[PDB]
């Protein structure tokens, strides 16, 4: 496979097609509002 750029590309191209991830996440807005306060209540000047 590693003798030909075409061959390698084809194999890689294929190997990746199969990955299928599915993650579970909290509501963004919720986290950004919570962490939001944590920052505001404790920061002395607009925290970057």
């Amino acid at each position: 496979v590693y003798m030909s750029p075409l061959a390698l590309n084809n194999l890689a191209s294929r190997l990746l097609r199969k990955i299928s991830l599915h993650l579970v996440m909290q509501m963004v807005t919720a986290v950004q509002q919570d962490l939001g306060e944590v920052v505001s209540v404790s920061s002395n000047v607009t925290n970057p």
Partner: protein, 48 residues
């Protein structure tokens, strides 16, 4: 300034009124489940 502040200090006892309106509901303030007096510092600040 000295005047206004003088009258101010002379009248602070009027604040007694708040103390009353609060103490008036002694039973209501204590005979219940929600009241507490110990500061659990570990409570997440975003919950407040």
């Amino acid at each position: 300034n000295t005047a206004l502040l003088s009258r101010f200090l002379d009248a602070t006892p009027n604040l007694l009124g708040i103390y009353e309106a609060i103490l008036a509901n002694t039973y209501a303030n204590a005979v219940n489940v929600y009241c507490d007096s110990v500061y659990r510092a570990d409570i997440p600040i975003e919950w407040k």
